[PDB]
Amino acid sequence: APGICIDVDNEDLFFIADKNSFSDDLSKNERIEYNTQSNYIENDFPINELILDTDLISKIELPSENTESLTDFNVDVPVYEKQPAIKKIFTDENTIFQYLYSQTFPLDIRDISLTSSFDDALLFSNKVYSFFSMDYIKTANKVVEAGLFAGWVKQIVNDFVIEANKSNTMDKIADISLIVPYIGLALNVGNETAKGNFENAFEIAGASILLEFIPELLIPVVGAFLLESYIDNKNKIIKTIDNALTKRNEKWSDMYGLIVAQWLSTVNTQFYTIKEGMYKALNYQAQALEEIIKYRYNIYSEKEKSNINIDFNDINSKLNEGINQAIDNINNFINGCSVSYLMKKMIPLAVEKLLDFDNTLKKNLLNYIDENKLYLIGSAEYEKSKVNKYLKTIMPFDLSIYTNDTILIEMFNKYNSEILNNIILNLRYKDNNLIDLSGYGAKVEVYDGVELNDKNQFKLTSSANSKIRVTQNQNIINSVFLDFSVSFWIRIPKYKNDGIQNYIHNEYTIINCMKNNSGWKISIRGNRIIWTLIDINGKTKSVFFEYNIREDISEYINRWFFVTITNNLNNAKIYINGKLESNTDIKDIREVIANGEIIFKLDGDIDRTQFIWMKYFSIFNTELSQSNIEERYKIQSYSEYLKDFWGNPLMYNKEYYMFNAGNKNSYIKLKKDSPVGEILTRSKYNQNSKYINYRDLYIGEKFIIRRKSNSQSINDDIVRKEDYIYLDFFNLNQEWRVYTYKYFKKEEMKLFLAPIYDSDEFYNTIQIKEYDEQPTYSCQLLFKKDEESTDEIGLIGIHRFYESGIYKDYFCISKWYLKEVKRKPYNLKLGCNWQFIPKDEGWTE
Amino acid sequence: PVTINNFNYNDPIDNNNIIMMEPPFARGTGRYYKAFKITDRIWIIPERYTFGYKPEDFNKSSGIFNRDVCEYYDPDYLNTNDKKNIFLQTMIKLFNRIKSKPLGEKLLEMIINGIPYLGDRRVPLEEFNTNIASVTVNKLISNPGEVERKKGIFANLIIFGPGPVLNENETIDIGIQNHFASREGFGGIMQMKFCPEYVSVFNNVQENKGASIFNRRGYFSDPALILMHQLIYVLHGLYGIKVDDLPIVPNEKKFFMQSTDAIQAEELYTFGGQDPSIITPSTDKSIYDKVLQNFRGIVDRLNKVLVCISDPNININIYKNKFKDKYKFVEDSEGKYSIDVESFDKLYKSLMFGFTETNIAENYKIKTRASYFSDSLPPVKIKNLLDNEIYTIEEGFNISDKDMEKEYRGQNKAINKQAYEEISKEHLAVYKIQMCKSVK
Amino acid sequence: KEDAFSKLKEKFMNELHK
């Protein structure tokens, strides 16, 4: 009788209510009349009212118990019988039950070891499956000397606690608040969550991937209303119209309650079983470690035990607090997933059918007003506007209507307090394409003319096929009372000097969301970015942001910046890089249609070489606060790598002109017949116009960054923080290098620029830095003696040197900068702050 | 107030509070049981519930009765007179714990006063009829060895000891010719099988407040709450509102899906907390409407009732005024009865949503599980409920003198190890799925 | 050719002491 067979209690299985459990009554018709009332039954009753109700207990005395004998014994006696206690089945699946079995071991076995192979744990008695990291497994499996043991015991216990407490995403820009990333490996529950990277799979598909079963919902087509004729009475016709609208609300509420009942008995049940699984999985992993520790302690000789101080109750106690911390995280994560499935995968499907019912009722009610217009005596038109006003605003879902359980209310209130759950469209790059990671499943189709890269940047060109079409989910809930935000990053190219008039006057649309000549629009006119609202009547409001085109150095022109647009009752606002720039009042407008197709396309009287870059386009169904936007600005600014002047990633083996944030109109030139950096002044814009001014950027020596050692990750050519590098530059044909002199007696000293040669009195090793904690494209350059040494010589910068005559600025190293870089606010205008400028298509001069 | 009667098992038969009862499911066959009147209309019979069970099923075997119970068997439970006295004194103590607070005292007062209607659906509208097995039960009042002589009594509740599965407590209504008076507005005699010492065990994995336990994991239940839970099913059955509508039924098309019986809305109403939200508003209203229509049947009967054919000592007007009070009907100047919709609404809600396990648990400061749908652990045996060092009328297990008041520490399996014994897995029967691996 | 490096080095050592 071979084959691995696991005995599973019926108790540990998933309770999933059949579709036949739920009522179909919402499909029946209602007859509406002058005196028709609403039907609600609250499942509550106050206990204090029950305890002090004088009417509850009977005042009437109990009649005598004695009576005539029973002679009619007729009665139905139920009959019971037993059934078998085992049912044998064969399955290909390896889910929760199978994965937990792999984490146990028999009582009599000695010398267990941990493994990441599920199949080996099943085959071999001494192998126990584990879902923690490769490093934990290896450290748990290590055998050591007696003197090192108590150190190893302290370490692996601590490592257990750390591994259990992992509660964050590795990708920091992903829009995910809480996650426990080892859940997939622990149970393989749902759609193969042990295979592949679980955190990655969760970002794409959400809570759905943990469900072992996707239930089939009952969502009935709400029945017709049959309004009564009262040809005599005006009063009763208006009451019938009022009773129709009031009964429409009952049908919304009952539909929501039908969805909540299915949620709790088919989805929230599954997530409960998952929480119980993780509790057991975690306890098995602690039991395995306690068995490994105990076994290895007893291999040592009896005298070696008295050189090793171990407390086994302390170990059990310390692992248990680690489990209890982990269970808190898991309960929060899973509770969040359950509410998420309710709000994204169930509620909207009900709303689809309820809007369809509202539509059929509106047609019915208006025809009823029209049939009775004579008996309404010209009040008719007041009733038609009441009907259209009442059926415009839809009933919002509130779980607290359908339950008084505080655990469920707090789940729901936590969900609504987390701003990431307000995202309704979130365009991101996966597998050479753009997709929606919001969870609402919007359709996205990118045509061939849009260039994409894996840094989430997309390019809209003037070509006809450079287009994206997003089709929004129609079942998300804000027509009249706007409450929504839009955010994205953008890099807008510089004007052409010859064609300044086409630039400054010709407005062109980039993103267009319109239906029946109503919606919203993002457009650009030269150095102005514009947000526009358009209502059903054709009315217009705008708010804009304009950046200065007469600036020595612009922070906006052809450089990546962050835009956020916010809309409520009063205002439409534009924020740039987290700060409020503009504000327009929008009360005058009424009813904007935001459910249209979104078209990403250049449209207008444009130059044929015009283009736009964009990144991280997303839409929120609420008005983002200043904090939310500033937080989002910082999060989307994060990288392991450094950035160049334009905001793109900084690269090895790329030609760069150097810029200094403290001396902005300055540049490095190699001095005539001398090996030092001479500092000149930048040549400004030559001639003509009046509207334009800038300073030349492609000027000074052409630098280039070179990596020190080949023994590293040679996958990409991207410069990261704390990397060791040589700073080189071109001199006619050859490549020269930047050095510092090993003797450095004064505070500031000129730098030695010479060809590539191994000298003995000059250091060449630079460490590239980023001392600024806020977002920036400025980096710093630190000289040391060599890589291993913890002493730091000084930072590269600029100083005004005195040299006698019988003052001039030089490219230097300085000690004074190291005493300033760690001050609280951080000086952006420090002379050690450099930025690298490559030659870019969107800046010509 | 409520008075709990005292007695010992060996006390003489007086044909008043200590009788030989012929209970409903014996039929007219000659099986009689010594029975004790604990309060007005409530009887205790300290003996095993055998009706519909084979004698051999009282032993553990390779089978089970229910797929969702961890079943403990013991054929020797209640097999001596001393054991029967222990049961009886334990029931007296639990009843005193129940009446120790106003909420539970009122539960008993409603049960005691909720007398069955003198009839059922087969009985003409113009008649009270007491000669049916849902209204009247016989006591044998002759001496030992003499020809049998009998008299009838009215009763509300008869509590037996357990059937084969000690830990499977159950409340039961009476059906005649395939209809149930306790489901159609009339009410009828209720029966219970109960065991105070073999209690359920649960955990609080989902709870982010107190998660203290040490591998011998979780909490054991207070028998007084277990009893009060069944007493709520008794209350519903006496007022004639035992639910028969659309049930929650588990899907079973896949290997990973749990198997249970159908669950009427009443079971979820009776638990309370979260669980009533699983019964849709559609179904909530379907039930409300059916109870009301049944109650309309009852007013019309009270307006038409003229005679009692089966007992000539029944005063027709005494019983009319009692049933008027029970169901909260109102009386006009001409003496006709009707339903006031305000007072029906208040009564219906107090019966269905007022008394719940969750409400009672909170009021008595007893810990219980979070939902009908949470996991159960194997039962345990409480050593001695009659020892006030372990369990009292006032505080149950959670006694303040012993520092068991806070965080329900008296019920915690890791803290109060003195209070219970584990049960050997050899004695338990558990429905299992044996999952064997295949491929392709 | 190494002496191109030496002739630059003295010009730096001059520039330093300047």
- Full DSSP string of B45-106: E-S---TT--GGGGS--SEES-TT--EEB-TTTT-SHHHHHHHHHHHHHHHHHHHTSHHHHH
- Own/partner pairs, A503-507, CB within 8 angstroms, 24+ separation: A504/A691, A506/A604, A506/A605, A506/A606, A507/A604
Q: Let me know whether A830 and A755 are in one domain.
A: yes
How far is A497 from chain C, CA to nearest CA, in Å? 42
Angle at A338 (CA atoms; ends B259, A567), nearest 5 degrees: 155
Residues A455 and A532: beta-carbon distance below 8 Å: no
Note whether residue A553 is domain-resident: yes
Other C-beta atoms within 10 Å of A545: how many?
A: 18
Return the residue matching tokens 């809480």.
Answer: A178
Task: List Cα–Cα distances, A844 to A336, A507, A661, A835, in angstroms.
Answer: 51, 21, 21, 19
Residues A109 and A17: beta-carbon distance below 8 Å: no
Residue A799 labelled as part of a binding site: yes
Q: Let me know whether A389 and A459 are in one domain.
A: no
C-alpha neighbours within 13 Å on the C-beta side of residue A80: 18
CA A218: distance to chain centroid? 31
Tokens of A688: 């003509």
Instruction: Find chain A residues with C-beta within 8 A of C12's C-beta.
Output: 675-676, 741, 750, 752, 754
Q: Are C11 and A752 in contact (CB < 8 Å)? A: no
Q: Are C2 and A749 in contact (CB < 8 Å)? A: no
Tokens of A653: 């083996």
Task: List Cα–Cα distances, B83 to A110, B10, B160, in angstroms.
Answer: 47, 12, 14
CA B82: distance to chain centroid? 25
Among candidates A674, A754, A803 on the partner chain, residue whose Cβ is nearest the Cβ of C5? A754
Nearest CA in chain A to C17: A803
Chain B and chain A touch, per 3+ beta carbon pairs within 8 A: yes
CA B247: distance to chain centroid? 20
Could you give phi then psi for residue A581, rounded to 5 degrees? -110, -45
CA A782: distance to chain centroid? 35
Q: In chain C, what are the helix, strand and coil shares in percent, each to the nearest 5?
A: 85, 0, 15
Q: How far apart are CA A644 and CA A725, in angstroms?
A: 16
Nearest CA in chain C to A751: C12
Residues A730 and A702: beta-carbon distance below 8 Å: yes
Other C-beta atoms within 10 Å of A231: how many?
A: 10
Nearest CA in chain C to A810: C15
Instruction: Find chain A residues with C-beta within 8 A of B176's C-beta.
Output: 74-76
Helix (H) or strand (E) holding B433, with range, is strand B432-437
Q: Let me know whether A479 and A581 are in one domain.
A: yes
Other C-beta atoms within 10 Å of A707: how many?
A: 15
Among candidates A43, A66, A276 on the partner chain, residue whose Cβ is nearest the Cβ of B284? A43
Q: Where are the beta strands (DSSP E) in A570-701?
A: 571-576, 579-585, 597-604, 611-620, 655-660, 666-670, 677-681
Task: List Cα–Cα distances, B122 to A758, A806, B185, B239, B316, in angstroms.
Answer: 113, 133, 13, 18, 19
Touching check for A16 and chain B: CB below 8 Å?
yes
Other C-beta atoms within 10 Å of A190: how many?
A: 23
Touching check for B138 and chain A: CB below 8 Å?
yes
**Which residues in chain B have their C atom more than 2.5 Å from the N of the next written residue, marking a break after them?**
none
Q: How far apart are CA A754 and CA A758, in angstroms?
A: 11
A268-297 helix and A234-266 helix, angle to the nearest 10 degrees: 20
Instruction: Find chain A residues with C-beta within 8 A of B285's C-beta.
Output: 25, 39, 41
* Chain A interface, best mutation among C9, C10, C14, by max A CB count within 10 A: C9
Q: Let me know whether A681 and A535 are in one domain.
A: no
Q: How far apart are CA A581 and CA A575, in angstroms?
A: 6
Residue A747 labelled as part of a binding site: yes
352-411 in B: which are within 8 Å (CB) of A?
353-354, 359, 363, 370, 373-376
| Number of residues that this document lists for chain A | 845
Residues B264 and B243: beta-carbon distance below 8 Å: yes
Residues A322 and B211: beta-carbon distance below 8 Å: no
Q: Where are the beta strands (DSSP E) in A646-709?
A: 655-660, 666-670, 677-681, 702-707
Q: How far apart are CA B328 and CA B308, in angstroms?
A: 23
**Of A144, A147, A173, A171, nearest in space to A156 by CA:** A144
Q: Where are the beta strands (DSSP E) in A433-589?
A: 434-436, 443-446, 451-452, 457-461, 468-471, 484-491, 508-514, 519-524, 528-534, 540-546, 561-567, 571-576, 579-585
Residues B122 and B177: beta-carbon distance below 8 Å: yes
Touching check for B121 and chain A: CB below 8 Å?
no
Residues A326 and A180: beta-carbon distance below 8 Å: yes
How far is B61 from chain A, CA to nearest CA, in Å? 9
Q: Let me know whether A409 and A429 are in one domain.
A: no
Tokens of B96: 């005193």
Continuous H helices in A372-479: 380-390, 406-417
**CATH code of the domain in which A562 resides:** 2.60.120.200
Q: Are A8 and B433 in contact (CB < 8 Å)? A: yes
Q: How far apart are CA B114 and CA A575, in angstroms?
A: 70
Residue type, B115: I
Using the CB atoms, write b or e for A580-602: b if 16+ within 10 Å. Answer: ebbeeebeebeebbbebebbbbb
Among candidates B27, B40, B288 on the partner chain, residue whose Cβ is nearest the Cβ of A62? B40
Q: How far apart are CA B22 and CA A69, in angstroms?
A: 11
Residue-by-residue DSSP string for A163-212? HHT--S-SSSSSS-S---TTHHHHH--SS-TTSS-HHHHHHHHGGGGG-S
Task: Tell me if residue A306 falls in helix, strand or coil.
Answer: helix
How far is C1 from chain A, CA to nearest CA, in Å? 11
Other C-beta atoms within 10 Å of B122: how many?
A: 11
Residues B25 and B172: beta-carbon distance below 8 Å: no
Number of CB pairs < 8 Å for A and C? Answer: 28
Note whether residue A202 is domain-resident: no
Q: Are C12 and A675 in contact (CB < 8 Å)? A: yes
**Of A437, A434, A427, nearest in space to A452 by CA:** A434
Q: Are A675 and C11 in contact (CB < 8 Å)? A: yes
Return the residue matching tokens 């209602």.
Answer: A30
Note whether residue A755 is domain-resident: yes
Chains that touch C (3 or more CB pairs under 8 A): A
How far is C11 from chain A, CA to nearest CA, in Å? 6
Helix (H) or strand (E) holding A502, with range, is helix A500-505
* Chain A interface, best mutation among B32, B142, B251, by max A CB count within 10 A: B251
Q: Which residues contact A765 (CB under 8 A, 6 or more apart)?
A: A708, A724, A726, A783, A784, A785, A786, A787
Rounded to a whole number of angstroms, the CA Rg of chain B reads 23
Rounded to a whole number of angstroms, the CA Rg of chain C reads 8
Residue B27 CB-density burial (10 A; 0-12 exposed, 13-18 middle, 19+ buried): middle
Nearest CA in chain B to A101: B435
CA A750: distance to chain centroid? 48
How far is A757 from chain C, CA to nearest CA, in Å? 8
**CATH code of the domain in which B263 resides:** 3.90.1240.10
Q: Let me know whether A463 and A605 are in one domain.
A: yes
Instruction: Find chain B residues with C-beta within 8 A of A401's C-beta.
Output: none
Q: Let me know whether A354 and A365 are in one domain.
A: yes
Rounded to a whole number of angstroms, the CA Rg of chain A reads 36
Among candidates B52, B255, B278 on the partner chain, residue whose Cβ is nearest the Cβ of A91? B255
**Of A287, A111, A290, A284, nearest in space to A186 by CA:** A284
Q: How far apart are CA A630 and CA A628, in angstroms?
A: 6
**Of A465, A541, A519, A455, nearest in space to A491 by CA:** A455
Touching check for B109 and chain A: CB below 8 Å?
yes
Note whether residue A477 is domain-resident: yes
Q: Are C8 and A749 in contact (CB < 8 Å)? A: no
Strands A434-436 and A677-681, sheet pairing: unpaired
81-100 in B: which are within 8 Å (CB) of A?
none
Residue A726 CB-density burial (10 A; 0-12 exposed, 13-18 middle, 19+ buried): middle
Helix (H) or strand (E) holding A226, with range, is strand A225-227
Q: Let me know whether A525 and A569 are in one domain.
A: yes
Continuous H helices in A342-492: 347-371, 380-390, 406-417
Q: Are B63 and A69 in contact (CB < 8 Å)? A: no
Q: End of a domain among A415, A443, A472?
A: A415
Residue A748 labelled as part of a binding site: yes
- Own/partner pairs, C7-16, CB within 8 angstroms, 24+ separation: C8/A675, C8/A754, C9/A752, C9/A754, C11/A673, C11/A674, C11/A675, C12/A675, C12/A676, C12/A741, C12/A750, C12/A752, C12/A754, C15/A674, C15/A675, C15/A676, C15/A750, C16/A741, C16/A749, C16/A750
Helix (H) or strand (E) holding A239, with range, is helix A234-266
**Of A270, A216, A185, A261, nearest in space to A13 by CA:** A270
Strand-pairing partners, residue A110, are none
Q: How far apart are CA A793 and CA A832, in angstroms?
A: 14
**CATH code of the domain in which A691 resides:** 2.80.10.50
* Chain C interface, best mutation among A750, A752, A761, A809, by max C CB count within 10 A: A752
Structural domain containing residue A796: 655-837
Calculate the CA dihedral of residues A196, A199, A204, A206 and round it to 10 degrees.
120
Instruction: Find chain C residues with C-beta within 8 A of A745's C-beta.
Output: none
Q: Are A69 and B278 in contact (CB < 8 Å)? A: no
Count structural domains, chain A: 3
Q: How far apart are CA B298 and CA B117, in angstroms?
A: 9
Strand-pairing partners, residue B436, are A5, A90
Q: Let me know whether A515 and A597 are in one domain.
A: yes
Solving technique: X-ray
Task: Tell me if residue A238 falls in helix, strand or coil.
Answer: helix
Q: Are A755 and C18 in contact (CB < 8 Å)? A: no
The experimental resolution of this structure, in angstroms, equals 2.5
Task: Tell me if residue A262 falls in helix, strand or coil.
Answer: helix
Strand-pairing partners, residue A669, are A678
Tokens of A100: 């937990």
Query: Order of strands, edge to edge, in the sheet holding B18-22?
Result: A66-67, B150-154, B136-140, B18-22, B33-39, B42-45, B157-160, B190-193, B170-172
Task: List Cα–Cα distances, A33 to B75, B240, B420, in angstroms.
Answer: 65, 33, 64
Q: How far apart are CA B20 and CA A835, in angstroms?
A: 102
Task: Tell me if residue A311 falls in helix, strand or coil.
Answer: coil
Residue A583 labelled as part of a binding site: yes
Residues B268 and B352: beta-carbon distance below 8 Å: no
152-181 in B: which are within 8 Å (CB) of A?
152-155, 172, 174-178
Task: Tell me if residue A765 falls in helix, strand or coil.
Answer: coil
Chain B and chain C touch, per 3+ beta carbon pairs within 8 A: no
Nearest CA in chain C to A676: C12
Strand-pairing partners, residue A613, are A459, A491
Return the residue matching tokens 């410069």.
Answer: A719
Q: Let me know whether A361 and A428 are in one domain.
A: no
Return the residue matching tokens 């291993």.
Answer: A788
Return the residue matching tokens 């118990």.
Answer: A65
Q: Which residues contact A766 (CB under 8 A, 6 or more apart)?
A: A724, A725, A726, A727, A738, A781, A782, A783, A796
Q: Let me know whether A475 and A559 are in one domain.
A: yes
Touching check for A39 and chain B: CB below 8 Å?
yes
Other C-beta atoms within 10 Å of A389: how many?
A: 11
Chain A and chain C touch, per 3+ beta carbon pairs within 8 A: yes
Q: How far apart are CA A72 and CA A65, in angstroms?
A: 19
Note whether residue A772 is domain-resident: yes
Note whether residue A50 is domain-resident: no
Instruction: Find chain B residues with C-beta within 8 A of A260's C-beta.
Output: 277
Q: Which residues contact B198 (CB under 8 A, 6 or more apart)?
A: B72, B166, B167, B379, B380, B381, B382, B423
Q: Which residues contact A48 (CB under 8 A, 6 or more apart)?
A: none
Q: Let me know whether A385 and A456 are in one domain.
A: no
